[PDB]
Subunit: 136 residues, 4 copies
């Protein structure tokens, strides 16, 4: 079964705010450090990032010219249909279909304004969704 | 495979004591709050309920005219055949078949009078049973 | 797939030292209490037993004339081939085949004399074995 | 499905530093004790070893002439491609293929010098790999 073609960029091109996949988890880069120990060697990059879904800190150290996978992020608007303590039921405003998003995949800052009828900015990465903020 | 046709009611029709399904768990409603922030918008209902089987507190906030699933509850009488620390063996007085109910699915107030020979009120929701009280 | 024909006895026939199956676990009866609340009703028995394999306390309350399953226990002698912290390797002295028994299934009192070359009394219940004591 | 032919040696031939398999885990022998209780019996060996992969202490007591399985250890050199907090990506210098090794399978003393570009000594036992030290 196919899904998409993996997209890559050189590690040296990443910057704070960029998105990268580390050990299967799409992450947002929070810090990057460069170094060069080899007199005639390649520069290395040490990336620190945070998981978009599990919020876990991850690191990756590799040559600046080595490829790193970048997640494809689709952004769209949805309307909240209902809110339970565990799931947010949404109506995709693009095709009007109903999508369920776990409460754990809601940006902390947006949890406080979750209410039926409100519109939210949603991000889809592969088969998972994350509610970014209210309005959108 | 089919089982039953899901039954629904509008959220605004629920009352304390009503039964509803929230995230797959049939629950008894313990409190309902109504609100209306939109000048010309729909009123919203915030439901607080307790899981019939796991006893967990659950909440659901949605428009008063949105459909909410209501569990089908079949009530019947059974006779206790045996009682272990983990399972209550019962004889369904309708067809005389033997049914096993986990001790965790016995209302706390009824656990104290569980004894072989006693009759109990039993509730069946889908493929699970709950012992409500002794006698029935 | 068939295995054996379940053997039963009336609860009222059990005594301290008897073996019974409670919720799938073969247990040794440690105490039995009898009672009779119904003027013209059946006497009831409250059995307290201990799991042969998990060592857990279990109880069963039912009429004295109700059937209770009794495990089939096959006793034989085996020679210890090797002993690790987790498994005892044995040679069945009946057919000379090698059988492995988890350390958790060794009577506490026998663990202290487990040594290669020693003979032990082994009990087999269905597909599980328990080392009872050294010598046998 | 076949893999390899199990290799054995007599327990009495093992020495500190030897490798043995105890309950499915390849281990390095750290201590061996010999004894002989039977006037005309066989000498026994008590082996204490440490798991190559889980680092767990294991013991095995058996006759000195009893067979014990010895793991086949293939040693080779690899170059580190990248290092995350959970996985070390390596290039097998024999065929240039990429192999991923969990951080837990890296000798503690080598973890401190893990860096892209460094060469490491790698050990393969069946389908698992362990990074022994930097350089190799």
């Amino acid at each position: 079964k196919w899904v998409m073609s993996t997209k890559y960029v050189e590690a040296g091109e990443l910057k704070e705010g960029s998105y990268v996949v580390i050990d299967g988890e799409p992450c947002r880069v929070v810090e990057i450090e460069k170094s060069k120990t080899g007199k005639h060697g390649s520069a290395k990059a040490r990336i620190v990032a945070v998981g978009v879904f599990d919020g876990g800190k991850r690191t990756l150290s590799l040559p600046v010219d080595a490829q790193v996978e970048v997640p494809i992020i689709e952004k769209f608007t949805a309307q909240i249909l209902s809110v339970s303590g565990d799931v947010i039921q949404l109506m995709d405003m693009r095709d009007y279909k109903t999508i369920e998003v776990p409460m754990k995949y809601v940006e902390e800052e947006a949890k406080g304004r979750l209410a039926p009828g409100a519109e939210v900015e949603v991000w889809q990465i592969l088969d998972r969704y994350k509610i970014i903020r209210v309005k959108g």
